[PDB]
């Protein structure tokens, strides 16, 4: 059970973090328990896009806004690589 008010609370806490990092973003995704690597890549693309359209008011600093959007970007890159690794071997 991942309530809407819970996810909004995770976002509030994420945007409140000074110098968030890549795991703080993956934490958000795990709460959704996404069943597939390509859906996870989508998640991070659509997340970054969402955060990037947020008004400047909700963030602490333009620097923390940029940091947060850079970590999203690193998360998308991580998710892509991970998608590739799963497809890199036949088994």
């Amino acid at each position: 059970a991942y309530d809407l008010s819970e996810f909004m609370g995770d976002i509030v806490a994420l945007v409140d973090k000074r110098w968030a990092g890549i795991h703080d973003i993956e934490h958000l995704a795990n709460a959704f328990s996404l069943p597939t690597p390509e859906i996870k890549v989508r998640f991070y693309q659509d997340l970054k896009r969402m955060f990037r359209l947020f008004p400047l008011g909700v963030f602490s600093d333009e620097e923390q806004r940029q940091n947060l959007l850079q970590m999203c970007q690193n998360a998308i890159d991580m998710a892509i690589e991970s998608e590739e690794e799963e497809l890199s071997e036949l088994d």
Binding site: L4, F7, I11, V12, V15, M50, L53, F54, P55, V58
Partner: peptide, 10 residues
């Protein structure tokens, strides 16, 4: 401030 973004988050 965050209220203002509640529909996007939804």
């Amino acid at each position: 401030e965050f209220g203002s973004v509640s529909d996007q988050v939804k």
